Every structure is written in C-alpha cells, then in structure tokens.
Design an enzyme around this catalytic site. Structure first.
Site, PDB file in Angstrom:
ATOM      1  NE  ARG A 252      -2.048  -1.350   3.536  1.00  0.00           N
ATOM      2  CZ  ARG A 252      -2.459  -1.894   4.683  1.00  0.00           C
ATOM      3  NH1 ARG A 252      -3.724  -2.252   4.841  1.00  0.00           N
ATOM      4  NH2 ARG A 252      -1.598  -2.087   5.673  1.00  0.00           N
ATOM      5  CD1 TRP A 261      -4.183   7.398  10.503  1.00  0.00           C
ATOM      6  CD2 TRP A 261      -3.034   5.587  11.168  1.00  0.00           C
ATOM      7  NE1 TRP A 261      -4.966   6.290  10.265  1.00  0.00           N
ATOM      8  CE2 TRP A 261      -4.283   5.168  10.666  1.00  0.00           C
ATOM      9  CE3 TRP A 261      -2.139   4.622  11.650  1.00  0.00           C
ATOM     10  CZ2 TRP A 261      -4.659   3.817  10.633  1.00  0.00           C
ATOM     11  CZ3 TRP A 261      -2.514   3.280  11.614  1.00  0.00           C
ATOM     12  CH2 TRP A 261      -3.764   2.894  11.112  1.00  0.00           C
ATOM     13  CB  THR A 389      -0.713  -8.250  14.404  1.00  0.00           C
ATOM     14  OG1 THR A 389      -2.089  -8.410  14.752  1.00  0.00           O
ATOM     15  CG2 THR A 389       0.057  -9.548  14.729  1.00  0.00           C
ATOM     16  CB  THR A 390      -3.056  -3.317  16.673  1.00  0.00           C
ATOM     17  OG1 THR A 390      -2.262  -3.145  17.858  1.00  0.00           O
ATOM     18  CG2 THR A 390      -4.201  -4.285  16.962  1.00  0.00           C
ATOM     19  CB  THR A 391       1.619  -1.480  14.496  1.00  0.00           C
ATOM     20  OG1 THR A 391       0.722  -0.385  14.287  1.00  0.00           O
ATOM     21  CG2 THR A 391       1.573  -2.443  13.309  1.00  0.00           C
ATOM     22  NE  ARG A 429      -6.772  -7.219  15.449  1.00  0.00           N
ATOM     23  CZ  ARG A 429      -5.918  -6.886  14.487  1.00  0.00           C
ATOM     24  NH1 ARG A 429      -4.615  -6.792  14.726  1.00  0.00           N
ATOM     25  NH2 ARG A 429      -6.383  -6.643  13.274  1.00  0.00           N
ATOM     26  CG  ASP A 432      -7.888  -3.733  11.429  1.00  0.00           C
ATOM     27  OD1 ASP A 432      -7.883  -4.903  10.967  1.00  0.00           O
ATOM     28  OD2 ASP A 432      -7.321  -2.783  10.842  1.00  0.00           O
ATOM     29  CE1 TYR A 508      -9.468   0.365   9.537  1.00  0.00           C
ATOM     30  CE2 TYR A 508      -8.764   1.377  11.592  1.00  0.00           C
ATOM     31  CZ  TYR A 508      -8.461   0.707  10.425  1.00  0.00           C
ATOM     32  OH  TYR A 508      -7.146   0.394  10.169  1.00  0.00           O
ATOM     33  CG  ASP A 513      -9.415  -1.173   5.478  1.00  0.00           C
ATOM     34  OD1 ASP A 513      -8.803  -0.338   6.188  1.00  0.00           O
ATOM     35  OD2 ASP A 513      -8.860  -2.191   5.007  1.00  0.00           O
ATOM     36  CE1 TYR A 515      -2.251   3.743   6.485  1.00  0.00           C
ATOM     37  CE2 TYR A 515      -2.398   1.584   5.457  1.00  0.00           C
ATOM     38  CZ  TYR A 515      -1.650   2.670   5.848  1.00  0.00           C
ATOM     39  OH  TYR A 515      -0.294   2.676   5.596  1.00  0.00           O
TER      40      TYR A 515
END
Ligand code: MG
Ligand code: MG
Ligand code: MG
Length: 536
Positions: A252, A261, A389-391, A429, A432, A508, A513, A515
């Site tokens: 992306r 962000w 994994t969301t960071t 999380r 998303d 969101y 979505d 992003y």
C-alpha cells in the site's frame, strides 16, 4: 513460484505534497497578530468574577477552536478551582459540561452530579427532552464514562433519541452541530478534524461568537497547517527517495494517510520532530505488514522474522532480493533516529521502539502461519497474538521518541503494557477486525478474528461483530479511567495513547476500511487539514 495479484489502490495524491515553500512574510504576519490575540484570550481566562456556566463555555469554546494548547496552565487552574469548590445547583447544560471538562482533564468528579436529573429509577427525566443544549452536552458527556459511572448508563440512548427528534427544526448552526455530534462525538474524534469542523462550520456561523477567539483560531489553524505541510513535504521527499512505489509494488502506497495518523497523535508545533519520526515508522511498518499480509511465502517470512530479531546488516544475504530492500531501509531508519537524537543525548531510547518492532514482526509471522495452516484459534489465543499485530504497542512507543521530555522511566512504564495502552490496542484490534472482516474474508482468509469469535462461542457474524463492539466500549471505559489523577506518567505521555484510539474510531467510522480505501473517509480529512486553508 508465482506471487499473489495486486488489489491495492494507488496513492490518491500524486506529488501534490512533494513541494511546499512557506510564504515567510505571511507566516510572520500571522504569528505577529496571534501574539496579540493570545494575550487578549489569556485575559478573558483570568477575568475575575465570572459565572460558572460562562467560565465552562469559555474553556469549551477555546478547546474546540484548537487553541487551548496555548493556555494549559490557565485552564488547569480554573478547572482545579471548579473541581474543589463543589457547586451543585445547576441545570443539565452546565452540569454535563462541568462533568465532561473535568473528566477529560483527569479530575475524578462524581457522577452523582446527575442525580437531580433522574427519577428514583435512575433513568433520566423525560421532562428534559426539550432542553436541546442540555441534551447535547449530556450526549457529549456520556462518552467519558468509566466503569464507576453506571449512573450514566442511559445518558447516551436518552440524549440520542431526543437530539434526533429535535434536529430537523433547530436553527443553524446548532442543527449542524447536533447532526455532526450524532455522527462523531467530541471525545472520540481526532482533535484537528473536530477543530477544523468547529471553526468553519459552527463557530464562524454563530451569531453569539466572540470575534477575537474566531480570528485567533483561524490564524492559528492556518499557521500550524503551514508547518504540517512543510513536514509532509519533507516526509514525501523521503518516501519518494525510497521508491517503494516501484521496487516494492505489492505494498500500500499511503504515506499521506500515515502523516494524517501522526498528525492525529499530536498536532502541536513542539512535536514536529516527533511527528516526522512517527510517520516514517508508521509507513515503514505498513510495508512490513503487507509483506506478511500479501506477498510472503511462509518460508520467506521466516527468514525475514529471524533477520529482524538478530537486527544486523549481515543478515541481508539470507533474504530474497525484494526483502533486502525493506530490511535495510528499516535498519537505516533506526540509525537515522539514533543520529537525530544523538544531539540531545536521547540516543539510547531508540532500542525501546526496536524491541517493540521485533515483537510486531514475531506475531506477523505467527498469524501468517495460522492462515497457511487455516488455524482458527480460540479468541483468547487469537488476541494474545493479534494485539501486537495492530502495531499500537509499537506506534505508542515510537510516538515518545521525538518527545523532547520523555525519560527512561516513561518508556519503562510503557513497556509494562499499562491498562491505558492495552485498551487503546484492544480498540484498534476489534474495530479493525469488524471494519475489514469482509475486505480480508475476500481472499479466503480464515485466520480472521471474527471467525475465531464465531467458532469459539458458536455465534453468528451478527453476534460476533456485536461482541467485538462491546470490547471496544469496555476499553473506552478503561481509557477514560486511565486519564484520571493521579496519573502514572505525565498527561503528555497519555494523550498520544488516547489519540491512537481516536484515530481508530475516525478511520473506521461506519465500519469501513479507511486506511486501505482512503477515498471515502480519510481523503476529506486530508483535504481539510493539509490542502485547504480556512477562508479568513
Ligand atoms: Mg494488514
Ligand atoms: Mg497484517
Ligand atoms: Mg485487519
């Protein structure tokens, strides 16, 4: 052998941000007037013998206009005075504003201030259904509840139904203010996004408005915007010199959204270096994400994951050519941070962000393994991996890097996964997973969280997405609670975590979505914050 196939949209923006030259004369003009308006505003705030309700509306107005970062000491002192005086004799409008402003600033004011507006059943007096300004302020207030505020359990539904009922016959701009509040409450919105809306769609059209505050707010917004555009220009130039748009075509291309962000986490001028570090990281981990998410064979991701753990340029030759590209870019980015921070002797703190990134990469590799195996873990086990994994643990750590006053003791607190950080991560999380359940369940993905939730509890995709929504609501109660004094660290290091959660809600919104598909949601925000100035 062959790879997947390209499904991602190209950047909307082309090179329209690549070049921006500040009109220095304009800058100095704006700054010169602002200094005069700043002192006029300060004197409004220090004016003796104001009424409670007038003082709260002044603080509220200044905060929504985006200029309260100039008066943190003054506003704090005033709210501190109000907190410690206990004036309970007011109407819904003033009481609900009092409640919200104090909670947002960490003052644990009792929700018993709302008792006088409820019957013996604890449900709000329906006789209040015609106090539109009271409903509006109650509505806003209902979004800062903690777990101790179940007295406000009914506030959101009660205010919502009656605000909807009143709205079509309200005068402007009140009608627009109500309609927008119902779409996006103040507490969970991105502050620049709400400020831009408030300044030009509402306050500019109020007949009551204070002209000094309006002019102040417009000049200050347009002046910070010049700095933001400079930052985005420099980051656009850095991203383009990387050229991941051609050498890594699978990922992306969203550096502008990434800057948005970073802007949501903090907009103030003193966080300029912080924003620029943060956005570089966000876009860089976005690449890594797409490598596991949409190009990486199971074996290839293993070599990548181990390379990241050892964190050493020696490891590049164990990697495929295209992974050498992202891997060295990552290692070089952190040598950059180290030198950029070398000046202030804050160089050492970089290893905190590095360790959090190693952790992200470990769980990318796990959830990749889960998809190729088609493993649908219990929801507990899924979250134990899917939180990182969301960071968000990692972006939160990163956000501190550029903050001149973040100390080791601050990173030490963040490293223990405090409840405020955990809640923000949870919100990301589960939202998303709801917003992108279809987007992902297109590509036969069975590793999705919702699917785990369905399998685990034996419930439909209906009840699944609902149950996730609730976890977001519980988490917001924990964020609000993590803001209350005495705070574990300075408020300055809590606000970025709050703002991370806000960005989730905003991107969101309406379960889309934003992003991956910025056209719908983010494009308007980016245009309002970074393209169009406020017509003065
Ligand atoms: Mg992804
Ligand atoms: Mg991913
Ligand atoms: Mg996702």
């Amino acid at each position: 052998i062959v790879r997947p196939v390209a499904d991602f949209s190209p950047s909307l923006w082309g090179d329209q941000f690549l070049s921006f030259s500040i009109k220095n004369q304009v800058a100095e003009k704006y700054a010169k007037e602002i200094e005069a308006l700043k002192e006029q505003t300060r004197n409004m705030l220090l004016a003796t013998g104001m009424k409670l309700a007038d003082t709260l509306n002044l603080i509220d107005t200044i905060e929504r206009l985006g200029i309260s970062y100039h008066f943190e000491k003054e506003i704090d002192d005033i709210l501190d005075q109000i907190y410690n005086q206990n004036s309970n004799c007011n109407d819904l409008c003033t009481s609900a504003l009092q409640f919200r402003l104090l909670r947002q600033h960490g003052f644990n004011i009792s929700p018993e201030i709302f008792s006088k507006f409820q019957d013996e059943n604890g449900k709000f007096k329906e006789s209040l259904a015609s106090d539109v300004l009271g409903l509006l302020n109650l509505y806003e207030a209902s979004h800062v509840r903690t777990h101790a505020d179940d007295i406000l359990e009914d506030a959101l539904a009660f205010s919502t139904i009656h605000l909807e009922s009143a709205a079509p016959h309200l005068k402007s701009p009140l009608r627009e203010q109500v309609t927008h509040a119902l779409e996006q409450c103040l507490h969970k919105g991105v502050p620049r996004v709400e400020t831009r809306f408030f300044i030009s769609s509402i306050y500019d059209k109020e007949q009551s408005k204070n002209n000094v505050l309006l002019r102040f707010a417009k000049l200050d917004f347009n002046l910070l915007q010049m700095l933001h555009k400079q930052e985005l220009a420099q980051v656009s130039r850095w991203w383009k010199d990387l050229d991941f748009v051609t050498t890594l075509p699978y990922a992306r291309d969203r550096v502008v959204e990434c800057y948005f962000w970073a802007l949501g986490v903090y907009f103030e001028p003193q966080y300029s270096q912080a924003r620029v570090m943060l956005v570089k990281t966000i876009s860089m981990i976005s690449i890594v994400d797409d490598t596991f998410d949409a190009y990486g064979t199971v074996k290839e991701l293993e070599a990548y994951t181990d390379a990241i753990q050892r964190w050493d340029i020696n490891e590049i030759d164990r990697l495929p050519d295209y992974m050498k590209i992202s891997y060295k870019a990552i290692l070089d980015l952190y040598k950059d941070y180290e030198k950029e921070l070398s000046s202030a002797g804050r160089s050492h703190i970089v290893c905190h962000a590095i360790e959090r990134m190693k952790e992200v990469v470990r769980n990318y590799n796990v959830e990749s393994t889960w998809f190729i195996e088609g493993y649908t873990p219990p929801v507990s086990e899924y979250l134990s991996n899917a939180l990182a994994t969301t960071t968000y643990y990692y972006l939160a750590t990163t956000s501190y890097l550029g903050m001149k006053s973040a100390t080791e003791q601050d990173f030490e607190w963040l490293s223990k996964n405090p409840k405020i950080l955990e809640a923000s991560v949870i919100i990301c999380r589960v939202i998303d997973d709801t917003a992108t359940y279809e987007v992902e369940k297109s590509r036969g993905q069975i590793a999705t969280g919702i699917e785990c939730c369905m399998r685990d509890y034996g419930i439909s995709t209906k009840e699944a997405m609902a149950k996730f929504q609730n976890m977001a609501e519980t988490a917001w109660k924990d964020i609000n609670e993590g803001l209350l004094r005495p705070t574990p660290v300075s408020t300055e290091f809590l606000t970025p975590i709050l703002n991370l959660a806000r960005i989730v809600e905003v991107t969101y919104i309406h379960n889309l979505d934003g992003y991956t598909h910025p056209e719908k949601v983010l494009k308007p925000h980016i245009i309002n914050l970074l393209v169009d100035s406020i017509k003065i």
